[PDB]
Design a binder for this molecule. Structure first.
Ligand SMILES: Cc1nc(=O)c2cc(CN(C)c3ccc(C(=O)N[C@@H](CCC(=O)O)C(=O)O)s3)ccc2[nH]1
Ligand SMILES: Cc1nc(=O)c2cc(CN(C)c3ccc(C(=O)N[C@@H](CCC(=O)O)C(=O)O)s3)ccc2[nH]1
Ligand SMILES: *c1cc(=O)[nH]c(=O)n1[C@H]1C[C@H](O)[C@@H](COP(=O)(O)O)O1
Ligand SMILES: *c1cc(=O)[nH]c(=O)n1[C@H]1C[C@H](O)[C@@H](COP(=O)(O)O)O1
Lengths: 290, 290
């Protein structure tokens, strides 16, 4: 009752029991702890997609491919009926950030823009950024092939100069990669984690990324480590999360990668699938705080 | 046998027992694990300066104040008989990084330069950077006073655009601050930790920083959390660390702050002292791998 999905359930219990009350930015209110870490094995093809609640896997995949492409237009996700970024791209939300000149859906130089184009000057979400900025992700993949013992395989979205241009500052903010005994591991530093809503999705996302990167460079996936800053439960999620805690985890699913492309941004959903995913049938709704 | 200094001693043991053989940049060789976390209480004025090995406290203090001032000239530490940065500022080391125009001792836009002037253009270590770049540390102090529940109190030295100008990329790279029940906590993400040499010094440094910041903003110190990426023991340190593991820890010392100045960069060593530090007397030499 300590490994795998129990890492997440034990974190929920810890926050409910010893989390402190916080009047947060959204006005919803939270219970919070600082600095918890969870670790998930990616061996034997395992990927930690929660079974005690059905995770929006199609959204995980498409958001991740959108990040990997460096894209920042929420409308591209919305065309696929993935609406997870629409609220932070709305006219109202953008105006509240002082971003009056931004088109609706244009989140600014967020997440994957920093991963692929760190330091590039942002124009709009539809601009061509090919060859602009520092491609941290491509550089990591090269280092993994050529010098896997390197201790500097860092991918960050925390760019102080660009925060004011982003709809929200990055939650999952800096990742490091590591190789030992033919296995690729990833540690994510996440400054802020909505434990009921974003965190399960973010775990699935970076675990997927680690599997995809490993297949590009001839390694096997090792471990995904999530280290949180402010790990919080929104007051509106407490009752539903108590319900989730009564559920017994089932074995995690496996990822089957059918092929790997030449460049990571060419991965498409047809190149891999989730095998053996058996989430509990009762859907749990966690209203997004805004 | 788990709290306080045992956090560090148990990490040493863990690396010795299950660390994997990993070659490294210096050619010395290491045993390595990825992702370990250590937590230290700063309550009751405690500061986690190791007692199983004498730590160079005066060096910790002067290095930190140098960082806080945004300074980057190793020659200024050497004038104070603190030589810890001399090797990475040498002509030979700078030339090996391609930094041919850099004067000896000028480490570039490292650590505190990023903390106080993120994004500013670097000239030399003697240039005046007042008002240039983003003062992340000052911003954090303001936020702690005005909106302590904020989830963005981040101070980073990881600037992809400036890495090539640095004598070494930052080891201790990104810190986050947090407030609960009138206590200030700090979590440091450290991508690379030399467990025998740098890590004890880095623990003392960021714990001191947390004490000093709390005194600037009317809070009490809470916890210091160190989260490592590549946590490693150099092969040359194994025997001395095994000797250290035989020493019984004594209670950690206490930090006594005598006054707080108006701005954090005005702190001097006369404004605080270490009470009751009783380290084991037999000096343990961990040669720096270069
Ligand atoms: C307050 C806040 N918390 C979040 O976790 C968050 C997440 C995103 C983006 N993101 C990473 C996600 C948003 C929504 C997700 C999701 O998994 N939604 C599911 C379940 C929704 C529900 O249970 O009510 C879905 O739409 O199926 S995942 C944007 C702003 C945020 N804001
Ligand atoms: C390989 C490497 N490991 C490090 O830990 C490291 C640290 C620094 C800067 N730094 C943070 C420090 C360097 C030396 C320290 C120190 O505590 N020295 C003590 C003990 C020396 C010894 O026992 O051999 C001293 O000089 O008194 S603390 C620079 C390059 C590095 N390079
Ligand atoms: C942000 C986006 C993501 O992918 N994951 C997340 O959990 N979140 C959450 C954290 C927090 O609840 C909120 C961001 O608000 P803030 O910037 O921390 O105030 O979204
Ligand atoms: C860097 C400086 C510091 O304050 N603390 C550290 O522990 N180190 C160590 C980590 C590593 O052994 C070496 C830096 O080498 P690399 O850039 O990780 O290859 O110094």
């Amino acid at each position: 009752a300590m490994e795998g999905e129990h890492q997440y359930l034990n974190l929920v219990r810890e926050i409910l029991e010893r989390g402190v009350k916080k009047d947060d930015r959204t006005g919803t209110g939270t219970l919070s702890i600082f600095g918890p870490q969870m670790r998930f094995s990616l061996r034997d093809d395992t990927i930690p997609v929660l079974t005690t609640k059905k995770i929006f896997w199609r959204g995980v995949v498409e958001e991740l491919l959108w990040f990997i492409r460096g894209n920042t237009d929420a409308k591209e996700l919305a065309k696929k009926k993935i609406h997870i970024w629409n609220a932070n791209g709305s006219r109202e939300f953008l105006d509240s950030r002082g971003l009056y000149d931004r088109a609706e859906g244009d989140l600014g130089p967020v997440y994957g823009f920093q991963w692929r184009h760190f330091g590039a000057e942002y124009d709009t979400c539809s601009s061509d950024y090919t060859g602009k900025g520092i491609d941290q992700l491509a550089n990591i993949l090269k280092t993994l092939r050529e010098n896997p013992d390197d201790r500097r395989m860092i991918m960050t979205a925390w760019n102080p100069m660009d925060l004011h241009l982003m709809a929200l500052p990055p939650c999952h903010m800096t990742a490091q990669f590591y190789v030992a005994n033919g296995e690729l591991s990833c540690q994510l530093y996440q400054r802020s984690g909505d434990v009921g809503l974003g965190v399960p999705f973010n775990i699935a996302s970076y675990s997927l990324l680690t599997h995809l990167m490993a297949s590009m460079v001839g390694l096997k996936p090792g471990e995904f480590i999530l280290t949180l800053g402010d790990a919080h439960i929104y007051n509106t999620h407490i009752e539903v999360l108590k319900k989730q805690l009564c559920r017994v985890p089932r074995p995690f699913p496996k990822l089957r990668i059918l092929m790997a492309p030449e460049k990571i941004e060419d991965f498409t959903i047809d190149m891999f699938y989730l095998e053996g995913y058996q989430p509990h049938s009762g859907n749990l709704q966690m209203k997004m705080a805004v």
